[PDB]
Amino acid sequence: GVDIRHNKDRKVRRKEPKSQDIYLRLLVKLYRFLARRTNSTFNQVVLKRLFMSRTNRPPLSLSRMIRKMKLPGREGKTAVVVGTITDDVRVQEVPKLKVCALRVSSRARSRILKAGGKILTFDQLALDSPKGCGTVLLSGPRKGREVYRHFGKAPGTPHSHTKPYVRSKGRKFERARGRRASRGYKN
C-alpha cells in the first residue's frame, strides 16, 4: 500500500480539437508535426490553440490588431490569430498588414486587402515560416463575454460589482431590500 492521492493525477487539458470539421483537423495534422519536429514554441502555442473552444478563442477586432502592430518595433511582421479577424467600424485608416487567421469576416477582409494587406491561411503561414519566425501572436480579449459579468463574489455580498441574473432591468426588478439603505440594508 502506497500513500498518494490519485485525486489530481489526470490532467484535464485538451489533446485534439473537439470539433469534427476536416479542414481544421488537417491544420492540426500539420501543426502537430511542426510542433514536434521544430524547436519553435510558436508552433506549440498555435497547436494548443487549435484545440480550444469558440469561447476560448475570441474574435480579434481590426482596431485591436492595428494598435498591437502600431507598437514600436514590430514593423514589417505578420500578426497571427487562431480566432477570427473582425471589422471595426470605429476605425477608419487601416495600414497595410500581414495577417494569419482561421477566419476573417468579409468586411475585415475587404478593408485589409484594399489597404494592400496580405491575408494568409495557416497552411500558408507554415510554408512562409515553419518556426514562427517574425510573427506577432495576438489574442482576442478572453474576458469579453457578457458571461463574466455574472462571475465572481456574488451580488449582495459587500464590495461585489457582479451583475445579477435578472429577468428584465427596470425600476421594479431588484433595487429594493438590499440595495437601497432605505430598505433594510445595502452591500
Partner 1 sequence: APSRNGMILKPHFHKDWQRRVATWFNQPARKIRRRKARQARARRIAPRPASGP
Partner 2 sequence: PSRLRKTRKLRGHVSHGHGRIGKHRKHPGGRGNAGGMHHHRINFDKYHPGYFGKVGMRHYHLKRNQSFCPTVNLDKLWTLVSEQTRVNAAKNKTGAAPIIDVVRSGYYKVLGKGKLPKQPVIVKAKFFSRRAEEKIKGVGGACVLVA
Partner 3 sequence: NFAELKIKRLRKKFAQKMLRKARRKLIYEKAKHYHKEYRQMYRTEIRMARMARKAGNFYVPAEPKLAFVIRIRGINGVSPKVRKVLQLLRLRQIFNGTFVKLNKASINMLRIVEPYIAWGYPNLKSVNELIYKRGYGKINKKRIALTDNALIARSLGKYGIICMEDLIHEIYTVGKRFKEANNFLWPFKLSSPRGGMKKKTTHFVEGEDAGNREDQINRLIRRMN
Partner RNA sequence: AGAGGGCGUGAAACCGUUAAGAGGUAAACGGGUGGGGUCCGCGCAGUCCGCCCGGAGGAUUCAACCCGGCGGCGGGUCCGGCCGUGUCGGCGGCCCGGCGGAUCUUUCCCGCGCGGGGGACCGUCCCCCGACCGGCGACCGGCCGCCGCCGGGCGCAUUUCCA
Partner RNA sequence: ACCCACCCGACCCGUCUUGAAACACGGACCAAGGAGUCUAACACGUGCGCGAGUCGGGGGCUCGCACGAAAGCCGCCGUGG
Partner RNA sequence: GGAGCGUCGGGCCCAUACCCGGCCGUCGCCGGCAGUCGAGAGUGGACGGGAGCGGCGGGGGCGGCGCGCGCGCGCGCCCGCCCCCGGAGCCCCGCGGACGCUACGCCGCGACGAGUAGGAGGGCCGCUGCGGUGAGCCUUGAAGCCUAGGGCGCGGGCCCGGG
Q: Which residues bind partner 2 (CB under 8 A)?
A: 89-90, 92, 154-157, 164-166, 171-172, 174-180, 183-184, 187
Binding mask 3-42 for partner 3 (x = CB under 8 A): xx--------------------------------------
Alpha helices, DSSP H only, in the chain? 22-37, 41-50, 62-70, 106-114, 122-128
Angle at CA of residue 103, ends 98 and 107, nearest 5°: 75
- Region binding partner 3 by CB under 8 A among candidate stretches 2-10, 29-37, 127-135, 151-159: 2-10
Contacting partner 1 (CB under 8 A), which of 154, 157, 177, 180? 154
- CA 122 from chain centre, in angstroms, equals 16
Q: And the C-alpha cell for 158?
A: 459587500
Distance CA 78, CA 69 (A): 9
Is the Cβ–Cβ distance between 101 and 157 less than 8 Å? no
Q: Which residue, 66 or 137, has its beta carbon nearer to partner 2?
A: 66
Is the Cβ–Cβ distance between 99 and 11 less than 8 Å? no
Interface contacts to RNA, rule CB under 7 A: 1-2, 4, 6, 9-11, 16-21, 24-25, 28-29, 32-33, 36-37, 41, 44, 52-56, 59, 83-84, 86-89, 103, 105-108, 114, 145, 147, 150, 165
